[PDB]
């Protein structure tokens, strides 16, 4: 009964931060990815991402700010090949080819996956319901899509989302020119998921705040009308439903707080699930709707629509993205 | 990199002044 003492501390509910068995993997990996990220974001040398001997600077010390700074994806010459430090002849080679990128995202994806499992674990230790982790699967799948799934389908981690602000934008623009993600019903569900999420978040927030029962005066915060762990609900759902039920019509409003809150969880999670699958499916080149030259007049002339205008914009990104990496007329990789 | 010479002072004041305002308010609250 010595190994039992270790197990008890790991699964202990009296730790300021819960460890858990998922955390046994999570803590080292996240620390590894974080430490490498901070160092690479600041002091890493330029990286030849497109594998054409054209190194791209991403760190602060090499002429970047917070906005333009990034950890650059591994070389296209590498592709999907596993590229740890011990596979390089030297750290100089490893840094030139985008080594840090693979080290970080792999430790991160592992750590993040264990983070989700860690959420189930504590909920089990506390006697909760375990589906909060299911909600976290929505952003986790999104990260898996741009860091792992899309590089797989395309055949290189060089086409993975860079660890940077501007690099992120670069990922979005090139993506649109090749997949027409805007005209894809899954990104559109994602937009509806995050716009609706923000809407409903603002909505739920305003209705509960509006129906707060007076417990305070004008010379103090209304927040002090609530005490942590009190038996009574701080607001009046009856009044709140009375308002929103008249703003539209009563049958368009929720009188059930459990049913209401479930909707609050369901809508943005499901929405993000789809846009996650959007990237994941467009990774295998099942692209957005193509209505280029769909409208034709009697003679045969092409009558342009807004889709054709979108196409012209996509042409602009396509012919310019990675201006030196193409030797043949069709962009496949 | 040839950056703005006022970037340093503008960023420093943008942090310091409102953060000091908060710190001042906090310490006089715990003392109450």
């Amino acid at each position: 009964n010595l190994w039992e003492r270790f197990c008890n501390w790991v699964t202990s509910t009296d730790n300021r931060l819960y460890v858990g068995w998922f955390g046994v993997i999570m803590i080292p990996t996240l620390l590894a990815a974080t430490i490498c990220f901070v160092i690479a974001f600041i002091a890493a040398p330029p990286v030849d991402i497109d594998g054409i001997r054209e190194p791209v600077s991403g760190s602060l010390l090499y002429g970047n700010n917070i906005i333009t700074g990034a950890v650059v994806p591994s070389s296209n010459a590498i592709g999907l090949h596993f590229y740890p430090i011990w596979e390089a002849a030297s750290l100089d080679e490893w840094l030139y080819n985008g080594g840090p990128y693979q080290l970080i995202i792999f430790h991160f994806l592992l750590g993040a996956s264990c983070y989700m499992g860690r959420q189930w674990e504590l909920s089990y230790r506390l006697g909760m319901r375990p589906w909060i982790c299911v909600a976290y699967s929505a952003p986790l799948a999104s990260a898996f899509a741009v860091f792992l799934i899309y590089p797989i389908g395309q055949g290189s981690f060089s086409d993975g989302m860079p660890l940077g602000i501007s690099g992120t934008f670069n990922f979005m623009i090139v993506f649109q020119a090749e997949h027409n993600i805007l005209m894809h019903p899954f990104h559109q569900l994602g937009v509806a998921g995050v716009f609706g999420g923000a809407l409903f978040c603002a909505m739920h927030g305003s209705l509960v705040t509006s129906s707060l029962i007076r417990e305070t005066t004008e010379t103090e915060s209304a927040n002090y009308g609530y005490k942590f762990g009190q038996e009574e609900e701080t607001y009046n759902i009856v009044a709140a439903h009375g308002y929103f039920g008249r703003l539209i019509f009563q049958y368009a409003s929720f009188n059930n707080s459990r049913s209401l809150h479930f909707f609050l969880a369901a809508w943005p999670v499901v929405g993000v699930w789809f846009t996650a699958l959007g990237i994941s499916t467009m990774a295998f080149n099942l692209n957005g709707f193509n209505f280029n030259h769909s409208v034709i007049d009697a003679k045969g002339n092409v009558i342009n629509t807004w889709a054709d205008i979108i196409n012209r914009a996509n042409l602009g990104m396509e012919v310019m993205h990675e201006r030196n990496a193409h030797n043949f007329p069709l962009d496949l990789a | 990199m040839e950056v703005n010479q006022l970037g340093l002072i503008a960023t420093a004041l943008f942090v310091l002044v409102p953060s000091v305002f908060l710190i001042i308010l906090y310490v006089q609250t715990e003392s109450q």
């Binding site: 931060l17 600041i42 942590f228 | 942090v15």
Partner: peptide
Amino acid sequence: METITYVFIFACIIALFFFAIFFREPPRI
């Protein structure tokens, strides 16, 4: 000097995390 400024702010944020977690205002029932 730009780098030093960027890192300094980032450092302060990480420090703030430590105090907001381990030296937070303890919630009481």
